[PDB]
Amino acid sequence: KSAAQTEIMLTCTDALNRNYITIPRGTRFLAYAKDTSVNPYNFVSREDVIA
Amino acid sequence: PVNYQLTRTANAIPEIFVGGTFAEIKQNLIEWLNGQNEFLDYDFEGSRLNVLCDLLAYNTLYIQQFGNAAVYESFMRTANLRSSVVQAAQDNGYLPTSKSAAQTEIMLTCTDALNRNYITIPRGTRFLAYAKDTSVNPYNFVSREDVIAIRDKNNQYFPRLKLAQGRIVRTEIIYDKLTPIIIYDKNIDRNQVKLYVDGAEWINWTRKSMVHAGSTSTIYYMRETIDGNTEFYFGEGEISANYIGGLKPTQNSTIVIEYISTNGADANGAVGFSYADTLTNITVININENPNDDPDFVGADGGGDPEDIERIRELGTIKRETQQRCVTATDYDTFVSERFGSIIQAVQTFTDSTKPGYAFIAAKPKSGLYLTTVQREDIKNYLKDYNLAPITPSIISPNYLFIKTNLKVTYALNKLQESEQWLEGQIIDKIDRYYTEDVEIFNSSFAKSKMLTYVDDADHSVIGSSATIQMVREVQNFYKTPEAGIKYNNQIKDRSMESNTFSFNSGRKVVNPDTGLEEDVLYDVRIVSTDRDSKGIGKVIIGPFASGDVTENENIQPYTGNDFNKLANSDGRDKYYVIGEINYPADVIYWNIAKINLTSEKFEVQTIELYSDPTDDVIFTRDGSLIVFENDLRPQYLTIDLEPISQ
């Protein structure tokens, strides 16, 4: 079987202002994968990165 | 050496004990079993009469440990296993301070509604303190002693007292004389205990607050009985005292022990205290001054936790050199120690020849820097009772040489977990651990390479490190410097010894906008040690000057040139005034601002840093001057850069 994959660029920010914020493995997202609207599926980053 | 008769040896476990590697035991047994005795008639077999030899060798190598260990912990210097160590240190009159509690002196401003004179403030008077790490939760405090106050002028009291950490607990017991009275709890500083027997008093023996010359019986004893639980007991006396000994109870009594719970060393923070006082008309007016004494204050001190094994030993044997009395420089070092210790990291007492009497004691608290007072006066009294009568002890504190790092650890972003902050602080204590272990003590130097190897030991991701360095030594009185004092002990690397800040006052008026005027408190100054010259020379300068205030006369004519003597950055109009000597090869600094003849009132607060950078990498020490870095108290110089690497 196989799973969908994209690359999204998150614009987010932190209150602590600390440099080199991380974004760990799972970071659950959810996506409609549109047929009309209703219901999401799920998403997980699964790797690391850095900002 | 020269003559071979001087070889001798240090403490040496003889070859008699040592103990087996196994197979060497197999060798010696076979030679004793097969040889010199039997020439085997054995009925087992060719192999069995062989094989069965090591079957009893495992019996040896076993009994050569299980029973042979006893002689290791029988003696002191060679023993391991605390229990034996401690238990064998009381017959040397020591005891190892199982734990400790924080102590301060606060002055309560409170007052009463009855206005009655001589208000009291009894033993417990529960307080509570955050001992700040952030804010949340208190610990506890109890005064534990007495005091008194006095009403003067306006109706108020100043019942300044001292206080310990924990709460208290009292367990009364009937003495069976067959029943080794004990405690069992993991606590109870042996420094502060009461233990009445049904009347009062019972000042015991092992630790005196008075020594009460004569006084005969009523003493008791406190030791160990291993296990962590303290033993109390009484002497052999009779009192039908008989001759000499402890009074002993009589077959039935109420024995009231009271100790302090001593939460632990976590309480070093102190700072803000609250009343929590319910007694009588005393209002608990607050305005509580934690440090009303003297200069910079860390909060409480002490807190203990049990002493390490490597500590006890060194202090365990040396107390045979003394007997409960200090006649010697090395004695004060043992009397300023776990008895009064946990408030003092290192001592090195010495006597100055020019000034008779007056045994001088340098001390560094674990809190860092200065002992303040009443923690000093406390060290005063506990000595002078055991001291050599005419001479008075005094606490000078050492002459501190700190060092300014400015180091960069250059980690890698890939392998971290907690990233910055937590690593920013994880590098602190590792550096701090380097000082506490090697260079915390006297006569020991430090090498920045050894600091970096604890730096690179932070966790993993840190790879490489490096630092500049400057030796900082801060003058106290300033304005002068002592006679032939203020010395680094190291080569100074000329074109160094850079100023601090300073300031000026006076300079006519120079009114400003807004409000009426000002005193012209701006326009600071600062000192520079210039160059070297034909041999030492080098002079030094007080700093930038515009014009006006000075006495020029014929003896000043301010100038070193536009040569070295680097410039302070301001308008400042140069014209640096020559002040003092600073001979480079034998390290000496000399100032005496009176040379240019200014007024001390024109200067702001004294106690200014100077901090030249060293020539050689390694910084030495002598003459009872420590190099110890303490961060938490003075952050002023520590600067580190985490500049990262992405692979």
XYZ file of C-alpha atoms in Angstrom:
698
model
C 0.000 0.000 0.000
C 1.077 3.653 -0.083
C 0.391 6.968 1.634
C 0.062 10.520 0.357
C 2.964 12.944 0.689
C 3.450 16.700 0.345
C 5.784 19.408 1.595
C 4.221 22.351 3.421
C 6.021 25.377 4.844
C 4.730 26.380 8.272
C 4.904 30.112 9.037
C 4.552 29.594 12.797
C 6.417 31.240 15.675
C 7.086 30.779 19.385
C 6.508 32.953 22.435
C 9.911 32.139 23.947
C 11.647 33.543 20.812
C 14.297 30.809 21.265
C 16.421 30.146 18.197
C 16.468 26.782 16.401
C 12.908 25.745 17.202
C 12.263 22.074 16.560
C 9.201 20.320 15.168
C 9.275 16.652 16.275
C 8.260 13.494 14.428
C 4.490 13.126 14.558
C 3.005 16.648 14.728
C -0.516 15.467 13.907
C -2.209 17.367 11.091
C -5.527 16.706 9.382
C -6.619 17.287 5.803
C -9.914 17.137 3.954
C -8.360 15.860 0.702
C -11.276 17.553 -0.849
C -14.258 15.810 -2.216
C -16.552 18.646 -1.241
C -15.585 19.290 2.392
C -16.753 16.957 5.131
C -14.325 14.911 7.296
C -10.505 15.017 7.501
C -8.090 12.116 7.183
C -4.765 12.693 9.044
C -1.140 13.738 8.464
C 2.159 13.265 10.278
C 5.472 14.902 9.408
C 7.478 11.887 10.651
C 10.889 13.601 10.385
C 12.759 16.142 12.358
C 13.645 19.316 10.429
C 14.536 22.578 12.262
C 13.793 26.279 11.753
C 66.957 9.963 46.927
C 70.657 10.029 47.850
C 71.084 7.666 50.791
C 69.154 4.463 50.102
C 68.013 4.279 53.742
C 65.342 6.935 53.062
C 63.205 4.782 50.739
C 60.720 3.430 53.336
C 57.165 3.454 51.907
C 53.783 5.142 52.139
C 50.758 3.359 53.596
C 51.222 -0.142 52.215
C 48.939 -3.155 52.443
C 51.510 -5.940 52.916
C 51.737 -8.893 50.552
C 50.152 -10.995 53.316
C 46.662 -9.762 52.510
C 46.323 -8.420 48.946
C 44.380 -11.415 47.645
C 43.993 -13.796 44.784
C 43.741 -13.418 41.020
C 42.457 -17.000 41.007
C 44.938 -18.959 38.900
C 47.926 -17.870 41.007
C 46.031 -19.500 43.883
C 45.776 -22.615 41.711
C 49.559 -22.428 41.302
C 50.439 -22.064 44.985
C 48.003 -24.762 46.102
C 49.269 -27.293 43.551
C 52.833 -26.677 44.720
C 51.676 -27.088 48.319
C 49.328 -29.959 47.485
C 51.496 -31.715 44.927
C 55.020 -31.392 46.282
C 56.803 -31.125 49.666
C 54.053 -33.262 51.291
C 52.208 -36.040 49.435
C 53.712 -37.100 46.074
C 50.233 -38.204 45.358
C 48.908 -41.466 46.710
C 45.438 -40.061 45.883
C 42.713 -42.587 45.050
C 40.563 -40.344 42.828
C 42.157 -40.579 39.352
C 44.854 -39.136 37.118
C 42.503 -36.306 36.155
C 40.270 -36.289 39.258
C 43.125 -35.899 41.759
C 44.099 -32.984 39.517
C 40.610 -31.560 38.869
C 39.632 -31.682 42.549
C 42.467 -29.259 43.333
C 40.698 -26.176 41.994
C 37.356 -27.356 43.409
C 38.865 -26.384 46.762
C 40.613 -23.380 45.191
C 37.260 -21.700 44.568
C 36.778 -22.392 48.275
C 39.995 -20.446 48.912
C 39.425 -17.518 46.533
C 36.028 -17.221 48.233
C 37.256 -17.363 51.845
C 40.127 -15.114 50.696
C 37.575 -12.330 50.165
C 34.550 -12.929 52.414
C 36.809 -13.251 55.444
C 39.744 -11.250 54.102
C 37.711 -8.092 53.508
C 37.369 -7.561 57.268
C 40.971 -6.393 57.630
C 40.397 -3.881 54.833
C 37.593 -2.088 56.681
C 39.134 -2.856 60.076
C 41.713 -0.107 59.568
C 40.771 3.419 58.442
C 42.979 4.651 55.587
C 42.491 1.410 53.650
C 38.801 0.984 54.367
C 35.885 1.251 52.021
C 32.267 0.878 52.906
C 31.312 4.063 54.769
C 29.921 2.305 57.778
C 33.198 1.018 58.826
C 34.811 4.400 58.078
C 32.359 6.520 60.094
C 32.049 4.097 63.017
C 35.850 4.074 63.324
C 36.029 7.891 63.215
C 34.200 8.596 66.498
C 36.944 7.144 68.681
C 38.974 9.887 66.974
C 36.341 12.356 68.210
C 34.844 13.508 64.922
C 31.342 12.378 63.776
C 30.399 13.110 60.146
C 27.514 15.645 60.223
C 24.824 13.391 58.722
C 23.018 16.449 57.324
C 22.737 20.217 57.807
C 20.161 23.005 57.809
C 20.193 26.554 56.484
C 20.779 29.467 58.846
C 20.394 33.247 58.683
C 19.864 36.172 61.031
C 16.849 38.394 60.395
C 15.831 41.484 62.354
C 12.093 41.649 63.003
C 10.636 45.170 63.175
C 7.462 44.021 64.944
C 5.604 45.571 67.879
C 2.967 44.705 70.473
C -0.385 46.212 71.397
C 0.261 45.930 75.143
C 3.392 48.137 74.777
C 5.007 46.001 77.522
C 8.780 46.289 77.729
C 11.115 43.328 77.154
C 8.920 41.438 74.704
C 10.024 37.856 74.197
C 10.076 35.716 71.065
C 10.085 32.027 72.097
C 11.880 29.044 70.582
C 9.976 27.856 67.529
C 8.234 30.906 66.012
C 7.441 29.133 62.742
C 8.471 31.029 59.620
C 8.392 29.938 55.992
C 10.678 30.809 53.101
C 10.601 30.236 49.364
C 14.393 29.835 49.059
C 13.809 31.076 45.609
C 13.877 28.961 42.557
C 11.229 31.052 40.863
C 8.538 31.328 43.552
C 6.246 28.408 44.279
C 6.159 26.627 47.683
C 7.875 27.522 50.985
C 10.054 25.293 53.138
C 10.031 26.284 56.863
C 12.072 28.161 59.484
C 12.331 28.140 63.269
C 14.313 30.566 65.414
C 15.018 27.901 68.071
C 16.529 30.331 70.612
C 15.207 32.883 72.974
C 16.481 36.430 72.358
C 14.610 39.488 73.751
C 13.760 42.976 72.475
C 13.737 46.540 73.818
C 11.264 49.377 73.330
C 12.905 52.678 72.401
C 11.413 56.023 71.336
C 8.543 55.088 69.035
C 6.877 51.863 70.084
C 8.608 49.136 68.073
C 10.863 46.145 68.628
C 14.008 44.839 66.945
C 14.065 41.223 68.135
C 16.780 40.157 65.705
C 17.194 36.383 65.894
C 18.776 33.486 64.033
C 16.880 30.560 62.577
C 17.416 27.010 61.338
C 15.736 25.212 58.453
C 13.510 22.384 59.648
C 10.671 22.345 62.138
C 11.298 20.307 65.323
C 10.239 16.948 66.731
C 10.196 15.733 70.325
C 9.959 12.077 71.364
C 9.985 11.352 75.093
C 11.133 7.890 76.167
C 11.462 5.859 79.365
C 15.063 4.773 79.926
C 15.320 1.007 80.410
C 19.169 0.935 80.530
C 18.797 -2.173 78.345
C 17.398 -0.074 75.470
C 19.817 1.708 73.095
C 17.802 4.901 72.628
C 17.924 6.062 68.989
C 15.987 8.029 66.353
C 15.932 6.229 62.926
C 15.253 9.258 60.695
C 17.622 10.362 58.062
C 17.930 13.839 59.564
C 18.644 15.747 62.777
C 21.774 17.866 62.517
C 23.976 16.835 65.410
C 25.167 20.440 65.582
C 21.853 21.570 67.104
C 20.217 19.237 69.658
C 18.902 19.654 73.209
C 18.023 16.342 74.936
C 16.761 17.263 78.384
C 16.555 14.566 81.027
C 13.361 15.371 82.969
C 14.828 18.438 84.650
C 16.673 20.580 82.120
C 20.083 21.165 80.521
C 22.239 18.042 79.819
C 24.762 19.971 77.708
C 26.311 16.581 76.678
C 29.979 16.146 75.790
C 30.998 15.621 72.163
C 29.981 19.189 71.199
C 30.110 22.154 73.567
C 28.539 25.550 73.007
C 30.058 26.757 76.316
C 32.429 24.071 77.720
C 31.293 25.133 81.227
C 34.602 24.641 83.033
C 34.173 21.876 85.586
C 30.445 21.034 85.771
C 31.342 17.335 86.099
C 28.444 15.020 85.185
C 25.204 15.563 83.127
C 27.027 14.840 79.848
C 25.732 12.415 77.224
C 27.100 10.955 74.009
C 26.150 10.843 70.321
C 27.822 8.553 67.837
C 26.589 6.419 64.921
C 25.661 2.732 65.326
C 26.032 2.705 61.520
C 22.642 2.422 59.807
C 22.346 6.219 59.596
C 20.388 6.319 62.873
C 22.135 8.182 65.683
C 22.918 6.556 69.030
C 22.450 8.280 72.367
C 23.724 6.769 75.604
C 25.122 7.693 79.002
C 28.232 7.045 81.033
C 29.138 4.525 83.712
C 28.314 6.848 86.609
C 26.530 6.048 89.843
C 25.782 9.251 91.837
C 25.172 7.610 95.211
C 29.087 12.001 90.887
C 30.809 8.892 92.240
C 34.251 9.757 90.860
C 34.273 10.541 87.129
C 31.865 9.775 84.316
C 28.399 10.595 83.090
C 25.635 11.146 85.620
C 23.461 8.399 84.027
C 19.663 8.396 84.407
C 18.167 6.454 87.312
C 16.498 3.304 85.977
C 13.347 5.223 84.996
C 13.119 8.747 83.609
C 11.449 10.884 80.974
C 14.161 11.540 78.386
C 13.003 14.316 76.060
C 14.900 14.598 72.776
C 14.212 17.518 70.482
C 15.895 17.916 67.109
C 15.356 19.827 63.858
C 13.696 18.118 60.907
C 16.198 19.683 58.466
C 14.370 19.404 55.133
C 17.698 19.476 53.304
C 20.203 21.518 51.321
C 17.534 22.562 48.801
C 16.802 25.665 50.897
C 19.944 27.724 50.165
C 17.838 30.378 48.402
C 16.450 32.224 51.445
C 15.470 35.764 50.310
C 11.908 36.805 51.170
C 10.527 35.603 54.509
C 7.028 35.837 55.958
C 5.923 36.138 59.577
C 3.501 33.217 60.037
C 3.514 34.285 63.690
C 0.722 33.604 66.162
C 1.719 34.132 69.793
C 0.272 37.230 71.457
C -0.073 40.978 70.835
C 3.109 41.022 68.699
C 1.958 42.512 65.398
C 4.696 40.986 63.210
C 5.153 44.360 61.507
C 7.403 42.718 58.882
C 9.834 45.057 57.117
C 11.911 41.918 57.493
C 15.546 42.497 56.575
C 17.172 39.189 55.692
C 20.707 40.613 55.364
C 20.988 43.597 57.682
C 24.735 43.316 58.191
C 27.153 44.171 55.440
C 28.106 43.693 51.748
C 26.825 41.267 49.148
C 24.543 38.504 50.403
C 23.749 35.115 48.833
C 20.819 34.141 51.030
C 21.073 31.336 53.569
C 24.052 29.031 53.977
C 24.704 25.420 54.831
C 22.212 22.697 54.037
C 24.675 19.842 54.171
C 23.738 16.419 52.859
C 26.044 13.715 54.257
C 29.780 14.145 53.840
C 31.535 12.140 51.141
C 33.868 9.267 51.988
C 36.944 11.051 50.635
C 36.218 13.969 52.989
C 35.889 12.080 56.312
C 39.185 10.165 56.032
C 41.372 13.250 55.615
C 39.556 14.877 58.536
C 39.334 11.586 60.433
C 43.047 10.949 60.916
C 44.110 14.576 61.359
C 41.954 14.826 64.477
C 44.354 12.438 66.175
C 47.019 15.113 65.658
C 44.739 17.398 67.656
C 43.012 16.433 70.832
C 39.862 18.590 70.974
C 42.093 21.696 71.015
C 43.658 23.946 68.382
C 47.248 25.040 69.010
C 48.370 24.814 65.386
C 47.688 26.309 61.962
C 46.609 22.878 60.740
C 44.291 22.629 63.756
C 42.124 25.630 62.870
C 41.745 24.083 59.428
C 40.360 20.988 61.168
C 38.286 23.076 63.587
C 36.936 25.151 60.704
C 35.583 22.006 59.145
C 32.594 19.675 59.456
C 32.228 20.892 63.049
C 31.546 24.433 61.803
C 31.798 23.246 58.207
C 29.420 23.058 55.242
C 29.478 26.845 55.577
C 33.180 26.982 54.590
C 34.733 25.339 51.526
C 38.429 25.937 52.288
C 40.502 27.662 54.952
C 44.328 27.739 55.045
C 44.749 29.597 58.324
C 47.994 31.503 58.772
C 49.701 33.867 61.205
C 51.238 37.173 60.152
C 54.651 37.767 61.697
C 54.455 41.565 61.860
C 51.242 41.400 63.878
C 51.465 39.086 66.907
C 48.502 37.211 68.263
C 45.637 37.478 65.805
C 45.490 34.092 64.068
C 44.199 34.935 60.606
C 41.676 32.673 58.898
C 40.775 32.818 55.229
C 37.459 31.173 54.431
C 35.250 30.752 51.381
C 31.612 29.771 51.991
C 29.934 27.332 49.643
C 27.561 30.226 48.968
C 30.544 32.061 47.482
C 32.597 35.185 48.189
C 32.109 36.643 51.666
C 30.811 35.102 54.896
C 28.889 38.340 55.723
C 28.623 38.566 59.537
C 27.134 36.567 62.448
C 28.146 33.595 60.349
C 31.642 35.002 60.958
C 31.166 35.903 64.629
C 29.792 32.362 64.900
C 33.059 30.896 63.587
C 34.818 33.289 65.973
C 33.242 31.972 69.169
C 33.353 28.233 68.449
C 37.133 28.520 68.055
C 38.079 30.830 70.929
C 36.665 28.295 73.403
C 39.095 25.620 72.170
C 41.696 28.191 71.121
C 45.043 29.176 72.640
C 43.807 31.675 75.214
C 45.624 34.995 74.555
C 45.529 35.005 70.739
C 42.242 35.993 69.102
C 41.071 34.406 65.834
C 39.988 36.706 63.025
C 38.332 36.092 59.666
C 40.018 38.124 56.936
C 38.603 36.056 54.004
C 41.034 35.303 51.152
C 42.047 37.631 48.333
C 39.927 36.509 45.404
C 41.245 36.249 41.865
C 38.426 35.411 39.488
C 38.825 34.852 35.746
C 36.796 36.231 32.837
C 36.175 33.546 30.210
C 34.209 34.636 27.123
C 34.167 31.141 25.620
C 32.242 29.593 22.725
C 31.214 25.923 22.724
C 30.183 25.659 19.011
C 27.831 22.658 19.158
C 25.990 20.984 16.271
C 22.251 21.466 15.748
C 21.719 17.877 14.618
C 22.194 15.814 17.768
C 20.681 18.043 20.461
C 17.448 17.414 22.347
C 16.801 20.245 24.819
C 18.697 22.609 22.451
C 19.784 25.943 24.020
C 18.946 27.103 27.566
C 19.192 23.654 29.186
C 22.585 23.298 27.484
C 23.436 26.927 28.318
C 22.970 25.865 31.938
C 24.415 22.386 31.510
C 27.743 23.965 30.567
C 27.653 26.120 33.732
C 27.838 23.408 36.377
C 30.404 21.400 34.403
C 32.672 24.445 34.509
C 31.574 24.903 38.119
C 32.364 21.245 38.793
C 35.883 21.822 37.464
C 36.519 24.568 40.015
C 34.963 22.680 42.934
C 37.102 19.613 42.218
C 40.547 20.902 41.165
C 41.091 24.621 41.700
C 38.532 25.356 44.437
C 41.227 24.763 47.037
C 44.399 26.703 47.835
C 47.805 26.458 46.156
C 46.225 24.791 43.113
C 46.294 26.348 39.651
C 43.917 25.776 36.751
C 44.495 25.268 33.036
C 41.947 26.499 30.510
C 42.567 23.266 28.608
C 41.261 21.399 31.650
C 38.231 23.692 31.748
C 37.550 23.025 28.066
C 37.682 19.257 28.506
C 34.851 19.565 31.018
C 33.229 21.995 28.574
C 33.453 19.477 25.733
C 32.050 16.899 28.168
C 28.705 18.749 28.357
C 26.700 16.082 26.583
C 27.562 15.048 23.001
C 26.560 17.624 20.391
C 29.156 20.081 21.670
C 32.290 19.535 19.586
C 35.283 21.766 20.163
C 35.488 24.925 22.272
C 37.840 27.820 22.954
C 38.138 30.924 25.086
C 39.989 34.112 25.673
C 40.826 34.750 29.329
C 41.346 37.629 31.745
C 42.356 37.416 35.403
C 40.044 39.713 37.364
C 41.187 40.974 40.768
C 39.063 43.639 42.439
C 40.454 46.204 44.875
C 38.537 46.986 48.066
C 39.443 50.469 49.315
C 40.725 51.639 45.907
C 41.991 55.285 45.764
C 45.356 54.049 47.069
C 46.086 50.277 47.019
C 48.013 48.822 49.989
C 51.780 48.998 50.427
C 53.446 46.642 47.923
C 50.088 44.886 47.546
C 47.667 44.292 44.649
C 49.641 41.595 42.820
C 48.474 38.963 40.340
C 51.348 36.457 40.909
C 51.364 35.940 37.109
C 52.981 37.637 34.137
C 50.683 40.484 33.171
C 51.161 40.743 29.370
C 51.817 44.486 29.144
C 49.298 46.731 27.421
C 46.697 45.281 29.792
C 45.290 46.009 33.276
C 42.295 47.866 31.927
C 40.392 50.233 34.203
C 36.800 49.657 35.098
C 34.193 52.463 34.812
C 34.532 55.207 37.505
C 32.841 58.642 37.139
C 33.245 62.253 38.274
C 31.392 64.855 40.310
C 31.893 68.641 40.793
C 33.118 70.272 37.568
C 31.287 73.502 38.465
C 27.505 73.105 37.886
C 26.547 72.625 34.201
C 22.774 72.971 34.502
C 20.676 70.882 32.133
C 17.191 71.169 30.590
C 13.933 70.236 32.338
C 14.546 70.614 36.079
C 16.857 73.153 37.696
C 20.393 71.801 37.296
C 22.695 68.834 37.874
C 26.081 68.142 39.475
C 27.841 67.172 36.201
C 27.962 63.536 37.348
C 28.692 62.349 33.785
C 32.171 62.376 32.212
C 33.755 59.287 33.775
C 37.425 58.251 33.923
C 39.433 55.006 34.031
C 42.979 53.699 34.380
C 45.467 52.223 31.886
C 48.880 50.709 32.641
C 50.578 51.737 29.340
C 53.775 50.061 28.092
C 56.901 48.363 29.334
C 60.236 50.215 29.208
C 63.980 49.775 29.829
C 63.368 47.344 32.646
C 60.097 47.506 34.559
C 59.002 51.163 34.484
C 55.660 51.407 32.694
C 53.926 53.899 35.026
C 50.088 54.006 34.746
C 47.453 56.735 34.305
C 44.256 57.707 36.088
C 42.361 58.486 32.890
C 40.603 60.935 30.583
C 40.324 64.584 31.613
C 38.858 67.612 29.837
C 40.214 70.669 31.680
C 39.697 72.499 34.948
C 39.614 70.405 38.093
C 43.096 69.226 39.223
C 46.133 70.758 40.901
C 48.679 71.084 38.097
C 51.542 72.886 39.910
C 54.999 71.750 38.730
C 54.642 68.077 39.708
C 51.909 66.870 37.343
C 51.857 68.401 33.814
C 49.439 65.698 32.630
C 50.729 63.655 29.694
C 52.051 60.295 28.607
C 51.979 61.187 24.927
C 49.792 60.037 22.057
C 51.821 56.811 22.345
C 50.450 53.758 24.137
C 48.359 54.391 27.137
C 45.315 53.560 25.039
C 42.466 56.050 25.082
C 39.079 55.918 26.750
C 36.246 56.539 24.299
C 34.400 59.801 25.014
C 35.080 63.446 24.348
C 37.401 63.146 27.317
C 40.116 65.461 25.956
C 42.977 63.028 26.750
C 45.640 64.613 29.034
C 46.149 61.427 31.031
C 47.662 61.999 34.481
C 50.556 59.873 35.729
C 49.842 58.107 39.014
C 51.787 54.957 39.890
C 54.498 52.369 39.240
C 53.472 48.827 38.172
C 56.771 46.958 37.824
C 56.137 44.164 35.309
C 58.721 41.391 35.963
C 57.925 41.037 39.664
C 54.203 41.647 39.561
C 53.345 44.796 41.526
C 50.700 47.497 41.165
C 50.849 50.890 42.856
C 48.431 53.806 42.552
C 48.033 56.397 45.323
C 45.836 58.933 43.470
C 47.074 61.505 46.004
C 50.039 61.937 43.632
C 47.855 64.069 41.340
C 46.065 65.319 44.489
C 42.353 65.076 43.817
C 39.551 64.715 46.383
C 38.073 61.308 47.179
C 34.627 62.933 47.269
C 34.955 63.567 43.517
C 34.904 59.776 43.002
C 31.875 57.491 43.086
C 31.640 54.164 44.913
C 34.872 52.238 45.499
C 35.449 48.476 45.027
C 36.249 48.561 41.320
C 37.504 45.728 39.140
C 40.673 46.040 37.061
C 41.234 42.625 35.408
C 44.375 42.357 33.317
C 44.656 39.403 30.913
C 47.336 36.776 31.621
C 50.460 36.134 29.582
C 50.736 32.365 29.968
C 47.689 30.132 29.596
C 47.888 28.616 33.092
C 47.137 30.879 36.059
C 49.068 30.216 39.264
C 48.342 31.119 42.878
C 50.185 31.801 46.125
C 50.044 33.696 49.453
C 46.542 32.505 50.330
C 44.789 33.932 47.260
C 42.213 31.647 45.652
C 41.151 31.374 42.055
C 37.517 30.275 42.269
C 34.719 30.999 39.808
C 31.216 31.369 41.243
C 28.555 32.201 38.657
C 25.199 32.376 40.472
C 26.328 35.230 42.714
C 28.115 37.440 40.185
C 27.018 36.911 36.568
C 28.831 40.133 35.682
C 31.601 38.293 33.864
C 30.509 35.107 32.256
C 29.743 35.253 28.539
C 29.383 32.208 26.310
C 28.399 31.805 22.658
C 26.551 28.735 21.407
C 27.137 29.518 17.712
C 25.912 26.363 15.993
C 26.814 24.181 13.013
C 24.457 22.618 10.462
C 25.722 19.470 8.749
